[PDB]
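Researcher: Here's my situation. A collaborator sent me these components and asked whether they could plausibly form a single complex. I don't have experimental data yet, so a predicted model of the whole assembly would be a useful starting point for our discussion.
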Amino acid sequence: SQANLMRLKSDLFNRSPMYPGPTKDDPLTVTLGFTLQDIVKVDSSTNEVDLVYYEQQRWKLNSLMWDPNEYGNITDFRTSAADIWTPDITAYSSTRPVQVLSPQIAVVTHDGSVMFIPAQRLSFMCDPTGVDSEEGVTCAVKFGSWVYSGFEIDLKTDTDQVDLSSYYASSKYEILSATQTRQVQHYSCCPEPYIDVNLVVKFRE
Amino acid sequence: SQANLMRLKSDLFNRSPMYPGPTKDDPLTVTLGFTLQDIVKVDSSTNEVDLVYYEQQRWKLNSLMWDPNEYGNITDFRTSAADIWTPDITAYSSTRPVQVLSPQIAVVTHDGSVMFIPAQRLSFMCDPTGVDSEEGVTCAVKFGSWVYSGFEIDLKTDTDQVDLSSYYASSKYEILSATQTRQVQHYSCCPEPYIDVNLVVKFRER
Amino acid sequence: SQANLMRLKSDLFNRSPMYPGPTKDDPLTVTLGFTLQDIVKVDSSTNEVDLVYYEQQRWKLNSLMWDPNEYGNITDFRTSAADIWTPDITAYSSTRPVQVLSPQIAVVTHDGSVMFIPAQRLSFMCDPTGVDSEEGVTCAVKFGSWVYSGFEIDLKTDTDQVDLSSYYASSKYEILSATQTRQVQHYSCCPEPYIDVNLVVKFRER
Amino acid sequence: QANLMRLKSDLFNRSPMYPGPTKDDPLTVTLGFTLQDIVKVDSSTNEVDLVYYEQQRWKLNSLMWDPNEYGNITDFRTSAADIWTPDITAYSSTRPVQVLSPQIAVVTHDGSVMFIPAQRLSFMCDPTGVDSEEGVTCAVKFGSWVYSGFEIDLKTDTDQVDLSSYYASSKYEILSATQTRQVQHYSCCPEPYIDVNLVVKFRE
Amino acid sequence: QANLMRLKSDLFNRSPMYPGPTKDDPLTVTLGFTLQDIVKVDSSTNEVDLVYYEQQRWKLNSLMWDPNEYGNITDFRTSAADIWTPDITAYSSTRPVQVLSPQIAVVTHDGSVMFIPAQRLSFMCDPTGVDSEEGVTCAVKFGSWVYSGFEIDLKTDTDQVDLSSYYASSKYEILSATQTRQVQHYSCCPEPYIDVNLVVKFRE
Amino acid sequence: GCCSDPRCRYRCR
Amino acid sequence: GCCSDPRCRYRCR
Amino acid sequence: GCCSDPRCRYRCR
Ligand SMILES: [Mg+2]
Ligand SMILES: [Mg+2]
Ligand SMILES: [Mg+2]
Ligand SMILES: [Mg+2]
Ligand SMILES: [Mg+2]
């Protein structure tokens, strides 16, 4: 039982060469979703705002598949996120290094899919002038791979609606809308598209 | 004595495969308890509150059992928490990474019991409005596994009374009640329960 | 070209001694470019200013070349910055350790060229008195290697214009001009040139 | 020198490391404090920040050697990671302690270890009244986090905190600083529980 | 590359690491300071923040080489993790020192190491009066934390702190800045202790 | 519901 | 208060 | 001067 799981992990990680990341011939799609917990503070002097959210990241690797019959009917397992490759999804307009609030553990399913949900606190560029009004303020931040074009890492969302069902009900700030939208940027000097997910939050006091 | 503890540890840690965590087949019960030390800071601009507590965690692994007559009558030992699997218990509504105030060391007993008690400072979401009144403020934070359902990790408490016997007597905040309650959630989808321990503190300015 | 990329990285990294940095005999040119995202903070009581920017670094090593035909027609690959040598480019007038905002990953191309683009937040010495005028203030910080002279690491920029096309349009500060310029100092004793890139930003309140 | 390389090889590579004390081979740790500065009081959170040197001394048979077999070396400096160190902890801190000195210890041929971390500690203390002639008294206990007195005994050489280095231009002047061994028992167990109580009285 | 790779492998992979200085193989460290900026004064806590380059120099036999055997290489750059470095510490800091520069050193074929960490230091200093013509004077000592003057001697090349790159638009002007070797003893023990005392007089 | 919980979520997509 | 003490509690429950 | 520069300073001595 535990013996099987030890076997499986040994087969997948120890006996197996490091997965080197996606390539143009073996591209990878990462599914992103956000669970918004709190707008923690706004800073009017620097135009920084702090969010707390869970970022669901899901992807699938052929080198992580197994046949459950060969491993005591095991269909998934939890493992430290260091034991596996993870995509380098980055906020493009942060002003401080992200703070990780949760254990770095992922769930791996027998078809090769990985589910990984880091909880984070993010400071990013946002002008809160007018939050104390009824129309409020709109802010936005793009998430995407820092180094991989869309020919190696594509992105998508399952829904355009951010999950607000865990939003702290006594937050200083209430959310009027929250969307998460896939965009194609050509944005630098390269002739290759980079993919991002644009998180757009309208909020007020 | 030392020679025996070295054999013991070497036989448990270097000559074994690492425990891969609990599974649906081999689930694990984790006992939680809180010793609340101080409410240090309440921030009314951000609705954050900072607590200092001892988190008592207890679990038992078959892979950690030993016959104490084979190892010089040793009944228990202290070891670095890096040498063993530890449950991924987390506050579900922190707003900063938890700060660890104590050595990361555990006590292992010959029946497989592990006792691990980290001291922590936690900022979490809490509206302190009205803490300066006589009624006080109530705040709550849930603790649970981040990735394991109740099919793999069951949480329990030995008591619903938070231990206040070491609450700092000159805190800015007086504690009115402090409870720790096992909660089970089911979702309309899945047979598996979801367990958390709900820490509920009512306090007010002293 | 996934078994091929494992092969390629194995040949380039595991099968070779580490590259020991440039020498007076085998010099290296590093190309620097800045993309300025935000002047997030000026502090008039300490004369520090905080920038957020992308620092594009590009150089080329013969030990990183490969024939794409021998490797599934792979022409480039992404790899952890720790797997390769990187230049020690430093701000000479920082007042806090630089904060890294992006993952430490580089792109290596089959001609041996490396591109590495760290996003940083930097606090540096700058007197912001006058920022709230129509003239604004001017600040400057030199970048260069900490231990290598120009005999070992030469610096250049592809353009003297800072990339402003990602500048936060709702910053508290508006950029009036931003240049990045190569500078050569000499000293009397010493034949080496000492090279830096001078970043000069003129700005005022929006 | 070539002798020192040999000695560190024999002590550190040719053996498994010390697994910590046991009820059957217990260990005495000697604690002493040198207070340098009360840096900060925070009357709205009741935290006070101390800067001090914490001298720790203990002795292992595992670290003995005969000097005449190692070029007459009587002691050496080694990184504190090469050796076991006691888990001495302030029981009422409110922030992780910031280390201010290199993590390096001194080992002597009788197996004595001297380890002296300089630390900035934030701990629970009510500073109201610090601006009077009488000042304020604050106290923080130090001890093992996981060991009882059956495995680690705590000792002081003196009850006097060393104030000979107190920062003379501190915002706070020290009125008295003591360090006292304390033993509590409990109904359940025969085992003592030892701590060292640092009591500091200070004003502006 | 070929020659340098050979040399580095000969010096670093072939040998046991240098174990630090000993009484029979003692070591002199030369220190000097390049003061860049007095960044912040704090009169609620009597802490001042400096930014400086600290130049350290010393010489190890185990790092010598014949340049003729190595393609006429006379020096190379290398990560400070590859070599031993002295534990020079400020004795009255109030926060862990912040490192501002890459941890890289320069080694010369006669065994000389040059290591120049840039640092931001918070240390104990009363800034009362900094807004006067006369200014305030502050001082901090630097030395080995764990080695006595029987193992590590300190020296400076000049008594004057280098001010030639002090930030010209700082809130604070420097009136004097010196760095001086001191020897002290403690009542208990025979070892001399060596520090370099950095004394800075400054005003708004 | 389910797909907000960091522990139901591997069962959702 | 042995069950409060982080050095005693392994012996309680 | 050259002894103010972390890149040149190895030469001053
Ligand atoms: Mg491409
Ligand atoms: Mg399940
Ligand atoms: Mg040169
Ligand atoms: Mg006991
Ligand atoms: Mg000595």
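Model: Some features of this prediction you could bring to your collaborator: The pocket of magnesium ion (ligand 4) is lined by residues D 148, 150, 191 (CB under 6 Å). Chains A and H do not touch (no CB pair under 8 Å).
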